[PDB]
Symmetry: D2
Subunit: 494 residues, 4 copies
């Protein structure tokens, strides 16, 4: 039930957002953001750098001062504000979904039904938490009354990637604002537009100036400035494992700001011989190909028990061959372009590595159109653990299918990775499902499904897939600083 | 009610502890540990380095393998084991208190009545948590059953300082073991002995081999090896802010292991004009001078409202002058030696800086004996915020007294620091107490008391005094890795 | 900032509400509801009895069937629905506040600014809980996976009084609906109208039929039918202690349905000699006189320390004398009529008892107008604990002022009661505040304030003032039935 | 690994236990307790009545006075005391197990390995909770600091049955003492001895006098006195649904004391066609026959899918026939006598009713020896839902086997009962397991197991099987009274 999109939405916001006002970079520099479907420049965007970050941080610090409107505001009112923002986003849903597709490349039907819905659910969920994250009264030894305050951690730097621009913004703003923090946010140069428009809505909703500040720009500049800033209390970063390390090192080298990381993965999707064949095949397809394969938790290692391997591979290849690649604004399109040229080439490079290393190319394997960054849905069979495409995050429409015999075997192989973001298990058997879900070293284990996200269930990596959790009650922890208050009393009684 | 101490306890453990066995360093090197009261070498200790740490980590990894005794053991049995350890420590309480005093220098009466009691309470507290830290069942959207497992984070490197050897070991082992982790622990070269003996008790209690491993040695070697290790999942460090940064950088540079830090402070102790004079004076004395001034949360900035300043200073100086410095085994001794020569000199250097910068030396200010590292209880009056001794952690028997007028003023001054470990407020007024406890940026705010610790109340730093919390339920968080399991079900019902 | 009221709002709903439809009583009987300001009949209302209750219960049971729209609905959607209801109530705020005043008698300014705001905050608060009340995953001994589901308790009978018609409905509906229960609600015969209109909004908001059912009528009929019903799972009752006992007896005599009770009180308001005189006097006045004295937690025993007694009494009498009694629709009116003739006479009876027993009548003491049920603000001084007006809930504009000397004395006197709903302490002293708040046996202790309610803080009685709590997270407990699920697994691991 | 029992343990305690002293009944009356294996009187026991209960309540009230040793004691010390008690019980384990068997009739091997182990785990579990049940600090609207104290509910009347004498005492004392309450306990006239000995241990462990008081006697006297007492704050009763109602009525008729109930059941044990036959058969046997069939949660309705019915019945009959009935002190004995003559006759009466109503008697059906109260393991086949033995709790060695076809069918039949204590599901299928566990209306649903209890997992009834939960964190709720404290502050900040 999807409203017709404006396939060329107007852009209203393309500057740096500080104190609820729009600003050029101090340097006046700008950078183009491209439509990945055409390769054409959509528009120019203010290129924030250290000096702009510095202004944003000072605005946030000021907004976070004891006695400020934001600090004095009732927690429940923070909730009202988050709900207002959600309402405004819903009002402009059709526009935002189109803009998202324009700048990112994902099919408009998905932007509208999936990304925007999830954004709304996330904000509305966290709205509910604003006045419900209690501290404790504690029965300490001796004649004392002891309790904890759950205070905001303070000025939060938030750095988000380009694969889910609006959704990532929501996953960050929701918990941070619900718990009374202020933020300086760096959005991805590939996809700055939708986030900037939301800032307009943040203003419209009534958030005090300085509470949310957005700085578009490049990573080694604006991003590094946030990570290294002496007055940023906490940084949250979603992106590559490689940059994640830069972030944590920067935090250690600067002011020991608190850090959470949502990084990449090479998530194993395990199909047992008793799985429902049709369901497993469609889910495995979805698990890998969703969002042009641009998911950190993509099912990029499809383990299939030998007894069903041949059939599973056949059906998978057929499903991949029938997948509709094309104009993201066309309702029939299942798969849009990759986000940019760098990704485009990286993916082609990996495909080549797959060919080179002896994986069986079963379909696709090349460019899918001659404008934009479209790539054919690609499937490799007989993939081995030692192969590059079996170890490294491809982040494109490239599926790896591996064969295994025993449950003990697949556990060891699935877990033999420095990633651990997610995993899935397809089986009808109670015991197998429980054995596997316990044994897999991943932040999320899905059973007979994949990519099931709920605002109420935490998500995050084991190992080098990250640290900390987002969503659910757990998502509040990293945005809270704990204070113990311990008072002498005349005589302690139970 | 204190048993007479053996003033020369025999040493039974001085090697590296791995798989419940004692080992020499691979290099066979050893290092002397000194009795700070005499300057004499107590004994030689195995000097662990990278290769030793590597063996310890492998032992831990093995003990943490799925299906291992430690992994399969009932959570409640982990609790039994912690209680057994506490029992064994209590059995050997008199010995351990003596050994603690011998190697550290703190008065034996305090070791016995304070340190060991606190050790016992910590372990017994955490024993109770072992089977009570629940995950969640979560009402996620759609036809799914979603829940979280609270799993052990895994192999935990733990690095502890010398000021509270036994207590720090307990604050680390308790939460870690209660939640089913394994540890590789680096103890301080100044104070290795008591921790090594406890390892014997850990074996005696029945903990599986590899669950707890201890590596004595130096920081830039053994410590750095742990922080940088590729198979250590989590590191907890207590020590200086300076080294804290090294730790977090090492974590970012290696495997993105999770990090918690308990660092230094320059905690403000605020005396309002309506405070109970006698109580405030005694508590302020205690707040600073306790444990030879070797507390991260020492009340090293004593702010006194002008109307009571003169009297407060007078009484403080008197109390300081009457403080008994001497042999830690003598029941009359209130203050032993500083831990070692480096600290000895650092403190003298700070005292000199205080004189140099124009603070009023009101008493002490020099060496207190000609053997060992004894320092006169020292008090500076009319201290100004810009002074070095008002900004930097001295970690010795050196009190700073500052004068202020208004509550608004003292809040801003107290908070004007990059530390934020603790603070205290002395007042009879309800409103003043609440205003201050809310406004002070510190991990713990004490009201009309100081240095009140309870195993049930969390403790840790704001700002550069650290990150994360120890003690209480909060102490379990950093030792837990959260897994979401999300299962497709036929039809979800409330 | 209050919109002008329609002083004769039209009535749209006066029937029994079942399955989102309006019905006459099976008997076709009706009863008048009166405007307490004039004594005139506002309108006729369906008089529900056992047979009507029976229909309502069956509708609720049906709506609660496994697989029903209400049972299958996402928890988060329950939240959306509660927020919609809140929105609809806000839309019709001016109307509802006027209708509330018309039927109940409270000043329209209060209905609008207080009752309706509180209604909105309650519903919006609970909307937030709907998908956040987790069960647990539990580390049980042995090779099992054990967890709990927090299920709805089921069909909930809810019986509410007349003193805060809209608010009481909110306090009941919020937690019940947030946790996915269904309700059969009995509203007070004195004040049925506003609750019935809200039922219309419940329908409009989109709640499935049968989820909320309302049955107007009398207590010994409709109420008793709910309490004794064989298919009602849980009953919540707010009202007199006397009827509370009937309710619990009925539950025990029928099907052992779960019970919570919010009953009366005789709450002590304790003014220490160091209190802020002006603040304490105004708050004490408010504490007693609010809502025509018709609050279960009214501060009906004002304990004043002897040193300030005379002045406090003087100021209190003056404040009471200046209190404006009259037409609730007039913006200048502070106090409307009592709810009905029965209460009117009960109160006059108590005033007479006060005179008879030797309390000092300091002002008021009689009827305040010759139409409606208006009573003069009345103050008794030198009240003694043994006096009837010091022991029994008057529920009218009748203040008792008692004198005391010591803190130990006042504690014992305040606690010497079979009520324990609330209490208050006025003092500037930290220690006194802490001593008293710990020692007073009451569900809520206010310090330097009174009647401070927040949707996030629980409220309920000690002793015979009730059992269970409303508001906050605690309010969810009585609406939840806990199921343990314990599953054999192949091998349990931490 | 079981120590040889003293088959005639000496009795040391047979009086009323008040203030850690032993007393005769005021009336000096005594009653015989019988050995159900022989029918011989073991010894005489003080017969407590109202006057004795009154003394016990006063002692408890006194021990619960503000400032008393028990009220002032550190929460953690409560835990130490519970652990000491557990230790003492373990010390006297062999003795207690024998005495339990002597008075109750259950096999000594079971008393020793099961009952006593469970007792120890329960107490040790709750010891850990003593200082961990936090209240909350709450982010309330306005300039206030609001928090809750979790206080003890107070004087707790606890009434326990005879089927698990020691275990029931533990399930009651653990949560109550851990949370700082005091108790007056009524133990069953059939089995008073072990609970009285434990009182001796309670004294030995160091519990202040009056904290635990035990009154042996009859139900309509001592029990009723507790339920109706004006100074008992809370009552917990385990027993028959019929008496449960008397208890709740008594609570409503007296002082509105808080009530929790653990009542009977007719729990369905559902065997699907894909279940592991051998496992299901042995578990179904255990589910029903354990403890002479005297478990409230006995699997007394065994539903078997038609395709496996014949085989399942055959194997069940064989297993029942081979069950060893005899002297509970003989290591070969699987089943002892029933608890007394009343039960003996009730069970025979039910067996006759089964024959009479047309159930197929497949084995047993009569008396098993001519001394004591031994009954043949009895199995009825082709049982129909309308039969009396299918509806009423038999509480003896009498198995009902019913046949069903579809999963929808069995859900409706299993749930068609006014009981709802427990249920079980045997199946290998993931979906079936999840569907059934969600749909069954029972406090505990076991999957592929039965009678799996853990101190950490809650247990209790839906419907008329009771209200409230015992064990786990949930077991603490009914022993806690919640107080909100709400303090005016100068300026509220997040
Ligand atoms: O990969 C996904 C991420 C994500 C978020 C943060 C990261 O760092 C990485 C990935 C977030 O949401 C997702 C939703 C996805 O699919 C959608 O999932 C939702 C609910 O799970 C459904 O409403 C839709 O049917 C389905 O299209 C798939 C992948 C992701
Ligand atoms: O500073 C203290 C630390 C500590 C621990 C870790 C750190 O990193 C820094 C400090 C631990 O324990 C302490 C106990 C202290 O005092 C004792 O504290 C306890 C309770 O607080 C009392 O029972 C004793 O009487 C009192 O002397 C004072 C300071 C510290």
């Amino acid at each position: 039930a999807v409203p017709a999109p404006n396939q060329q939405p107007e852009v209203f916001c393309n500057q740096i957002f500080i104190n609820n006002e729009w600003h050029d970079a101090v340097s006046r520099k700008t950078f183009p953001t491209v439509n990945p479907s055409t390769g054409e420049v959509i528009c120019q965007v203010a290129e924030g750098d250290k000096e702009d970050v510095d202004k944003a941080v000072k605005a946030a610090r000021a907004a976070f001062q004891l006695g400020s409107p934001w600090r004095r505001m009732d927690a429940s009112h923070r909730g009202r504000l988050l709900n207002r923002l959600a309402d405004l986003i819903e009002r402009d849903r059709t526009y935002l979904a189109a803009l998202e597709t324009l700048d990112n490349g994902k099919p408009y039907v998905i932007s509208y039904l999936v990304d925007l819905d999830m954004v709304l659910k996330c904000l509305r969920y966290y709205a509910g938490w604003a006045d419900k994250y209690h501290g404790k009264t504690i029965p300490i030894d001796g004649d004392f009354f002891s309790y904890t305050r759950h205070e905001p951690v303070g000025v939060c730097g938030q750095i988000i990637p380009w694969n889910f621009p609006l959704l990532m913004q929501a996953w960050k703003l929701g918990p941070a604002l619900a718990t009374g923090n202020v933020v300086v946010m760096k959005v991805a140069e590939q996809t700055p537009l939708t986030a900037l428009y939301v800032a307009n809505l943040i203003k419209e909703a009534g958030f005090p100036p300085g509470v949310v500040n957005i700085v578009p720009g490049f990573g080694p500049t604006a991003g590094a400035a946030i990570a290294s800033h002496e007055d940023v209390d906490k940084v949250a970063f979603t992106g590559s494992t490689e940059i994640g390390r830069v972030i944590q090192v920067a935090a250690g080298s600067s002011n020991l700001k608190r850090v959470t990381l949502e990084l990449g993965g090479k998530s194993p999707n395990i199909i047992m011989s008793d799985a429902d064949m049709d369901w497993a095949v469609e889910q495995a397809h979805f698990a890998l190909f969703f969002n042009q394969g641009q998911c950190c938790c993509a099912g990029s290692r499809t383990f299939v028990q030998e007894d069903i391997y041949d059939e599973f591979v056949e059906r998978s290849v057929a499903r991949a061959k029938s997948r509709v690649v094309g104009n993201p604004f066309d309702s029939k399109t299942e798969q849009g372009p990759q986000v940019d040229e760098t990704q485009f080439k990286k993916i082609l490079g990996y495909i080549n590595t797959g060919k080179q290393e002896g994986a069986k190319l079963l379909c696709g394997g090349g460019i899918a159109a001659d404008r934009g960054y479209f790539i054919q849905p690609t499937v490799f069979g007989d993939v081995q653990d030692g192969m590059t495409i079996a170890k490294e995050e491809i982040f494109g429409p490239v599926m790896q299918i591996l064969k295994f015999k025993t449950i003990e075997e697949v556990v060891g192989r699935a877990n033999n990775s420095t990633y651990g973001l997610a995993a899935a298990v397809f089986t009808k058997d109670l015991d197998k499902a429980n054995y596997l879900s316990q044994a897999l070293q991943a932040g999320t284990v899905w059973v007979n499904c994949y990519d099931v996200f709920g605002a109420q269930s935490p998500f995050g990596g084991y190992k080098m897939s990250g640290s900390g959790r987002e969503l659910g009650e757990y998502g509040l922890q990293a945005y809270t600083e704990v204070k113990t208050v311990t008072v002498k009393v005349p005589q302690k009684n139970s």
